[PDB]
UniProtKB/Swiss-Prot annotation, chain A:
It comes from the Bacteria. It comes from Vibrio cholerae serotype O1 (strain ATCC 39315 / El Tor Inaba N16961). Keywords: Acyltransferase, Aminotransferase, Pyridoxal phosphate, Transferase. It is an enzyme of class 2 (transferase). InterPro entries: Aminotransferase_I/II_large, AON_synthase_class-II, PyrdxlP-dep_Trfase, PyrdxlP-dep_Trfase_major, PyrdxlP-dep_Trfase_small. GO terms for molecular function: 8-amino-7-oxononanoate synthase activity; pyridoxal phosphate binding; transaminase activity. Its cofactor is pyridoxal 5'-phosphate. The modification N6-(pyridoxal phosphate)lysine is found at residue 229. This is CAI-1 autoinducer synthase. Its EC number is 2.3.-.-.
Length: 382, 364
């Protein structure tokens, strides 16, 4: 057929302005011996034999034609035991499964927001959190990253609202000042929403997360997480210390108008949970390696804001980012490009995601290859 | 928690749970038995528990875009985590804040939300009403016409050939959501566009893969270059994790089974017609022309009584109420699948006959 001008032109303009000939996030194919640091599989559970075996197992013997929205399966007898188990693991009263972390955030915010509702959101909070509030026509008030003072001032000005943060930030790998945020939430009669996508499983007792580690669990209204990180699965979940998960399934558009996880998917998650709560060994190893890399990189003078297994190289503009990218990939390092719309146009990041399979030798190489880039150079860092 | 949330939640529980006789949301009925008649699943060719498909999935989990594009006749196919995501991402890619989107009143909520997320200018046209559409485009300019090939609640069929002509006449792009026709309709299940010989004049087609394909995913088909751009523009495509590679393998087997399921299609097509005719002659309005039959039950209170009646007598039954429908135009949807029996069909007709009427409630 023939696309209307009002589309062809958008396509043409985009291709010319965004597409080395490929989109910035696409570099060169990597070799087996290269060090790949792109997966959110922090405990390297992707290929765990017990998980795969249990998925395969339940996947046999279905009824189980439950192709319909989860809203129709909110009777007790239809709700997966993995919800109760995730709730107990985490310390929250209730858990609700979602089709993704994105959906968990959009759905939860739709359930708890009115168009008038004040939403105080960290400037670096995940896009799903920005979008959920926007979809709800909430009044978003962003505060400077991890800046509690600014937050305080904002709430002073606009009144009670929902405070929304990532526990660990997906781009920069920094950690929210969660204890202070709980105090502020109490000081002003707000509700707190913490996205633990990058801390659930890697942090806390048995990996119960950062809120459990700091003993804040009972003090927080809501917690969300993609289960597609440490849990290594395409789903999400909403935890509530209240009765909000009773309503979400009937209010959230993604919960209502998109199909639910199949029963066998939940069964896998149960086994994943068990493996995760026993994985003290990989947690420790991952914590230690990330610190080594952090320290390694902070010497050298690089801006390394991280306090976690996520490390962001701040590489300025797209041109300069391409250059860094090519340089790291030319050596053994990959390497995930964060650019618009995820970042501001000239504040791009090449994220290094560590996992518990990375070893001492590999860190060293990464530091060395970064030391070379600084400043065998050819490009800059912010 | 804080009043501004507590107040909202209390009101909601009061006006959506407490008012029903079981104290539950309206969609929540009684527990089915074997062998009550269950008509809720969207798995139209009853593939959910197919031996081969399960085998292929497990196999690949231990240890397709091209095929789907060829299957359907479109130039390109791009996979998505859901039909919802497919629609939302497609709309986000081709829309600008300015764009006219001409959308059938009953088109799936994902298309509505997709246009809205993109800040498009939505122009609702009355269900399957081409005159209304003609007027709106004359008034507002070129834009994207968006329809369900088969509508999710009513089971009506879009007037596709006439929409193709309208789009050509008025310089519009056309988006067809084939979620409820892909696999059940057309040559080897290629769908309604294919059945009608219209594939080559539609710009875009989308589909949940969670109906006939019995899988949690979606796809976007393009007769142009858009699928090259969707992956770097759509928020669901950017900020939400992808399908794992073994998931795609399952779809390949599924596709093969669907391609060969001429038998199941035919039986389903026949059962649906038998039901449509049986229910119509009772004087219920039955707009459907497919395996989706909408019992029109008016208001929530009446709907509750209708569904309690049906379930009490072995028929289930998916309630569609706000926000899926108007407050006063609820539907109890019967979704047929290829496993459904003649005897079961007669049984449904019988139960609705007694229903129309034991008194107690009405149908529209
Ligand atoms: C017409 C239509 N499009 C899209 C969807 C959503 O598809 P999915 O459940 O894969 O998100 C549905 C919902 O059932 C639908 O009926
Ligand atoms: C903090 C945070 N929340 C939510 C998400 C979305 O998770 P999902 O891919 O399961 O939709 C992500 C990124 O994927 C994230 O980094």
């Amino acid at each position: 057929p023939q696309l209307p001008d009002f589309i062809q032109n958008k396509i043409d303009h985009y291709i010319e302005n965004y597409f080395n000939g490929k989109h910035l996030v696409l570099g060169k194919q990597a070799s087996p011996d290269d060090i790949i640091l792109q997966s959110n599989d922090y405990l390297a559970l992707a290929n765990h034999p017990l998980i795969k075996a249990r998925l395969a197992k339940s996947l046999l013997e279905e009824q189980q034609s439950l192709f319909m929205s989860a809203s129709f399966l909110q009777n007790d007898y239809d709700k997966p035991m993995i919800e109760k188990r995730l709730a107990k693991f985490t310390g929250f009263d209730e858990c609700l499964l979602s089709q993704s972390g994105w959906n968990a955030n959009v759905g939860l915010l739709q359930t708890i927001c009115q168009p008038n509702t004040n939403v105080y959101i960290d400037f670096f909070a995940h896009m799903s959190l920005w979008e959920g509030a926007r979809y709800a026509n909430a009044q978003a008030h962003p505060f400077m990253h991890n800046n509690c003072d600014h937050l305080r001032m904002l709430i002073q000005r606009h009144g009670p609202g929902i405070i929304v943060v990532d526990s660990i930030y997906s781009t920069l790998g920094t950690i929210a000042p969660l204890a202070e945020l709980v105090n502020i939430s109490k000081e002003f009669g707000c509700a707190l929403l913490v996205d633990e996508s990058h801390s659930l499983g890697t942090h806390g007792p048995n990996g119960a997360g950062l809120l459990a580690e700091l003993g804040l669990t009972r003090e927080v209204h809501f917690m969300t997480a993609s289960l597609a990180k440490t849990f290594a699965y395409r789903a999400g979940a909403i935890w509530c210390n209240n009765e909000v998960n009773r309503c979400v399934p009937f209010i959230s558009y993604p919960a209502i108008f998109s199909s639910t996880l199949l029963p066998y998917e939940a069964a896998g998650l149960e086994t994943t949970l068990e493996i995760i709560e026993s994985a003290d060994n990989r947690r420790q190893h991952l914590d230690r390696m990330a610190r080594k890399l952090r320290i390694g990189l902070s010497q050298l003078g690089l801006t390394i804001r991280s306090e976690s297994q996520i490390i962001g190289l701040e590489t300025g503009d797209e041109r300069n980012t391409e250059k860094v990218r090519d340089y790291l990939e030319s050596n053994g390092v990959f390497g995930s490009v964060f650019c618009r719309p995820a970042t501001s146009k000239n504040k791009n990041i090449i994220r290094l995601s560590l996992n518990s399979d990375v070893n001492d030798e590999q860190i060293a190489k990464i530091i060395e290859v970064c030391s070379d880039a600084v400043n065998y150079g050819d490009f800059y860092f912010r």
